[PDB]
Amino acid sequence: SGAIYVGNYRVVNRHLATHNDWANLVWEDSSRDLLVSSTTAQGCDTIARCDCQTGVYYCSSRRKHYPVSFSKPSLIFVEASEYYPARYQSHLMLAVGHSEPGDCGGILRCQHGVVGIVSTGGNGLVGFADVRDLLWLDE
Numbered sequence: 780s781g782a783i784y785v786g787n788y789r790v791v792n793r794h795l796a797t798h799n800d801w802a803n804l805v806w807e808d809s810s811r812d813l814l815v816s817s818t819t820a821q822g823c824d825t826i827a828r829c830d831c832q833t834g835v836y837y838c839s840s841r842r843k844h845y846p847v848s849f850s851k852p853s854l855i856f857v858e859a860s861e862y863y864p865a866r867y868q869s870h871l872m873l874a875v876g877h878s879e880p881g882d883c884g885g886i887l888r889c890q891h892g893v894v895g896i897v898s899t900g901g902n903g904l905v906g907f908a909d910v911r912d913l914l915w916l917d918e
């Protein structure tokens with residue numbers, strides 16, 4: 780679990796979005812596993828606008844932060860799950876690091892701000908949905 784709170788937006792994994800997220804929908808994209816809903820309170824976070832390929836993520840299944848080197852956002856095949864059929868997930872960044880399904884929502888940050896959130900993983904890999912391209916989150 781986890782979310783990004785920036786301005787009057789809440790960014791969550793689309794597969795973990797609540798009934799309240801969908802009732803306050805701003806934008807969603809199944810191919811990216813992202814959903815953004817509107818909030819009444821002003822958020823605590825800021826979004827990186829950069830091309831970093833290193834950062835630090837929070838891993839809930841270890842209660843720890845780990846440093847990572849990750850690939851640029853790309854189209855990567857993701858096997859079928861309970862949430863989606865087998866498909867290519869877009870804007871995904873992969874890195875070597877521990878992850879389990881409930882780690883989804885953990886934030887990846889670089890020195891410039893929030894980069895993305897855990898979305899995929901397994902076998903010593905962790906995948907992050909990028910949010911740096913969503914310029915409208917800042918306005």
Ligand SMILES: Cc1cccc(CNC(=O)N2CCC[C@H](C(N)=O)C2)c1
Binds near residue numbers: 861
């Ligand atoms: C995070 C993680 C770590 C170890 C193992 C896994 C395995 N489950 C998944 O790959 N997904 C379930 C949730 C949605 C995912 C998606 N973005 O399509 C797919 C996932």
Ligand SMILES: [Zn+2]
Binds near residue numbers: 827828831889891892
């Ligand atoms: Zn950066």
